[PDB]
DNA sequence: TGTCTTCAACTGCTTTCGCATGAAGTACCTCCCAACTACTTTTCCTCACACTTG
């Protein structure tokens, strides 16, 4: 009945410590935001909000 | 003596990335707690009978 996981469960499945914190990670110096159109910028630029 | 064949039980996975917002188990046990009522507690107060008198 929901037995605390051991190191084998800790390392595998969807997570696989390898998959959730090694093959992909959170990163610093990053932001996420809803994108808004704008034709006046270059086609190679990105409009960054002053925040 | 030696090699071969099918079935059923067992293994591991089968969208990604984030918000929310975290909450909730529970038997067995209880000692603690809050209660109503009664009972008990500490200081204080005030009167009273007998022998004897004449």
Swiss-Prot record:
Cysteine-cysteine disulfides: none
Subcellular location(s) per record: Nucleus, Nucleolus
Subunit structure, interactors included: Component of the RNA polymerase I (Pol I) complex consisting of 14 subunits: RPA135, RPA190, RPC40, RPA14, RPB5, RPO26, RPA43, RPB8, RPA12, RPB10, RPC19, RPC10, RPA49 and RPA34. The complex is composed of a horseshoe-shaped core containing ten subunits (RPA135, RPA190, RPB5, RPO26, RPB8, RPB10, RPC10, RPA12, RPC19 and RPC40) where RPA135 and RPA190 form the DNA-binding cleft. Outside of the core, RPA14 and RPA43 form the stalk that mediates interactions with transcription initiation factors and newly synthesized RNA.
Note: Present with 2840 molecules/cell in log phase SD medium.
Chain's role: DNA-dependent RNA polymerases catalyze the transcription of DNA into RNA using the four ribonucleoside triphosphates as substrates. Component of RNA polymerase I (Pol I) which synthesizes ribosomal RNA precursors. Besides, RNA polymerase I has intrinsic RNA cleavage activity. RPA190 and RPA135 both contribute to the polymerase catalytic activity and together form the Pol I active center. In addition, subunit RPA12 contributes a catalytic zinc ribbon that is required for RNA cleavage by Pol I.
Family: Belongs to the RNA polymerase beta' chain family.
Protein name: DNA-directed RNA polymerase I subunit RPA190
Organism whose genome encodes this protein: Saccharomyces cerevisiae (strain ATCC 204508 / S288c) (Baker's yeast)
Organism lineage string: Eukaryota, Fungi, Dikarya, Ascomycota, Saccharomycotina
